[PDB]
Amino acid sequence: RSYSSPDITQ
Amino acid sequence: SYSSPDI
Amino acid sequence: DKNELVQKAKLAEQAERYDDMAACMKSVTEQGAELSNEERNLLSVAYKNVVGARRSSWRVVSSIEQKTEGAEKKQQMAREYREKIETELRDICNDVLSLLEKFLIPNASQAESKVFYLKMKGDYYRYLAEVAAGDKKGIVDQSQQAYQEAFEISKKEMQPTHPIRLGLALNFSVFYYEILNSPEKACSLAKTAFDEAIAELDTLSEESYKDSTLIMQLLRDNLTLWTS
Amino acid sequence: DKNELVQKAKLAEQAERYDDMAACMKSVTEQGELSNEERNLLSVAYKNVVGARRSSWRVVSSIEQKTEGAEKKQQMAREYREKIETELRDICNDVLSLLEKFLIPNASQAESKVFYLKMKGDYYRYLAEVAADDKKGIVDQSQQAYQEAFEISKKEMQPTHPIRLGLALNFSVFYYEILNSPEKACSLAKTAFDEAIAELDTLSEESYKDSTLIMQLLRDNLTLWTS
């Protein structure tokens, strides 16, 4: 599939 | 330690 | 107590027990106070992993269901199993979308979190759209309108390199590509967001937001994927 | 209906829903002998089910032991560790009951007897990883199951057989990690590796890959343990 945002805040 | 995977 | 519930979410996160983590953060959200950025992150991580597991299982089993035309018993089993996973998936999404509508969007007191939650609303309606089949039209239009509102706010309120603005553009392009089968629009949105960020970065002598590097990589790589 | 539960276990496997898969293969077992295929389904399912809990347990146990100057947090870590540990023990107990009630008694061929007795050693070893008055009995059960499997495998399987190699691997881990007996662990691993070396020349490409994957793990532990 497409890549979607892993919504990661480091 | 490594142990066995499946086969 | 909220701090107990938040501490438990952090334990669950380390243990990769995301169903536990999500239950804790649902409970915190339902207390009705605006979430801290820490709590917002915990909520988002937990449910992204809870729903992601079901979405991945759904795709595999739906593919098998398609592949088994002519195998009467196997296809019925695959169908029933796909329906069971899909029921979990719809229940997770509806839980998240209820939290967003009852608590998270209304209590958002700064633009950043407003965009974050409207994006999340776009995301979880998109996940419903991945499995819906008429019913689907309304689900698609809820996703698009949530994304569109977030997008407009992010253009007025956030720099091009802001990771929430970039992650919104990424997911909104995926919505156009995968849900609306509108690959030209998807590529336009993704490329414009990447280009605006690069332009900003080319005017800066300091590093920008560290989370945006990852999102820009995925924007670029979707464009490559979508143009084979 | 066994064939329906098996086909469902296979869907669950593809879906990476290992709790579902394990429930299916448990029900298949509570019929009464498993194919080569059904045996690997049961094994794969429970290995992943218990594996998730072992991983969580290690992380939370580490938080529990490291936390200082935060008594409520430490207590929360202890209680969460205990909850995970209860799941883990319940999984091991279920597997060990299937082995005792159905799988080991009905195993007609040496291949399946070694497979199931190794499995018995494994799930008692997983109990021993967490056991702080029951530990001695758990360890004795693990050792005895491994030894029973070891003796059958030495008589009835080629040294390159992946199950014989995997048994030697896990039994060496038992000696190193559970019995704190690094000399016995190294001996078991080195001899199994060297017995297999002798005969790799005879194997097909696929069987060669099968055997050498486990041999690599043996060498990797030997390297770790002797540094």
Brief description of this entry?
The complex is a heterotetramer, with two copies of chain A and two copies of chain C. Chain A has no helices and no strands. With 10 residues, chain A is low in regular secondary structure.
Features:
heterotetramer; A: about 10 residues; little secondary structure; about 0% helix; rod-shaped; C: about 230 residues; mainly alpha; Delta-Endotoxin, domain 1; 9 helices; about 85% helix; about 0% strand; globular; signaling protein; 14-3-3
Note down, in words, how this protein is organized.
The complex is a heterotetramer, with two copies of chain A and two copies of chain C. Chain A is mostly loops and 10 residues long. Helices cover 0% and strands 0% of the residues of chain A. With 228 residues, chain C is mainly alpha-helical. In chain C, helix 2 crosses helix 3 and helix 7 (163-179) packs antiparallel against helix 8 (183-203). The radius of gyration of chain C is 19 Å and the shape is globular. At the C-D interface, helix 1, helix 3 and helix 4 of C face helix 1, helix 3 and helix 4 of D. It is classed as signaling protein. Keywords: 14-3-3, Usp8, phosphosite, binary complex protein-peptide, signaling protein. It forms a tetrameric assembly.
Number of helices of chain A: 0
E-strand count of chain A: 0
Shape of chain C: globular
In the CATH hierarchy, what is the superfamily of chain C?
14-3-3 domain
CATH class placement of chain C: Mainly Alpha
Shape of chain A: rod-shaped
Beginning-to-end CA distance, first to last residue of chain A: 24 Å
Most strands sheet of chain C: none
* Biggest contact: C-D, 21 and 21 residues
Structure class of chain C: mainly alpha
Modified residues (Phosphoserine) (chain B): 3-4
Biased composition (Polar residues) (chain B): 1-7
Organism (chain B): Homo sapiens (Human)
Protein name (chain B): Ubiquitin carboxyl-terminal hydrolase 8
